[PDB]
Amino acid sequence: APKPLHKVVVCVSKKLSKKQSELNGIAASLGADYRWSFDETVTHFIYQGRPNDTNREYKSVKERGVHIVSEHWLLDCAQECKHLPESLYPHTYNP
């Protein structure tokens, strides 16, 4: 049975550790997989920050070219039950 985030693999940044289990579960309810820390399987890295952010984990993921999205990407995908465009939710996104 189709779910909107099938084949997505989320990883919540260390910065967002207090929200990590909750966000993993929100992603999983939409059919995504999740990793507890970053690796080569991750498709979507959840992160909140600033222009030219110096966070080490963020910079390492950015080098790998995977999607880096605000937590609001996941929250809005959940509200809509849809795979929403990642480009609308950069790490600097603020509602």
Side-chain angles (χ1 to χ4, degrees), residues 11-94:
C11 176
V12 177
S13 62
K14 295 160 174 287
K15 182 188 281 193
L16 291 174
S17 66
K18 294 186 213 56
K19 300 181 175 171
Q20 177 175 41
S21 296
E22 185 174 5
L23 292 171
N24 288 342
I26 289 164
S29 290
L30 293 164
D33 278 7
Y34 65 92
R35 299 288 99 88
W36 288 101
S37 62
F38 185 77
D39 69 27
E40 41 294 326
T41 71
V42 171
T43 63
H44 291 68
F45 181 71
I46 321 296
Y47 184 71
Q48 249 52 57
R50 68 189 199 280
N52 306 277
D53 204 310
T54 60
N55 181 263
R56 184 184 297 280
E57 189 190 29
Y58 165 76
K59 284 172 48 193
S60 302
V61 174
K62 185 146 90 84
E63 289 183 333
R64 301 296 288 123
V66 310
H67 292 292
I68 301 174
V69 290
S70 168
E71 69 164 321
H72 292 283
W73 174 75
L74 184 56
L75 301 177
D76 289 359
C77 285
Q79 187 183 264
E80 291 293 340
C81 204
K82 295 176 194 73
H83 184 157
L84 302 175
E86 292 85 355
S87 66
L88 297 172
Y89 296 96
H91 77 292
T92 50
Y93 175 86
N94 45 346

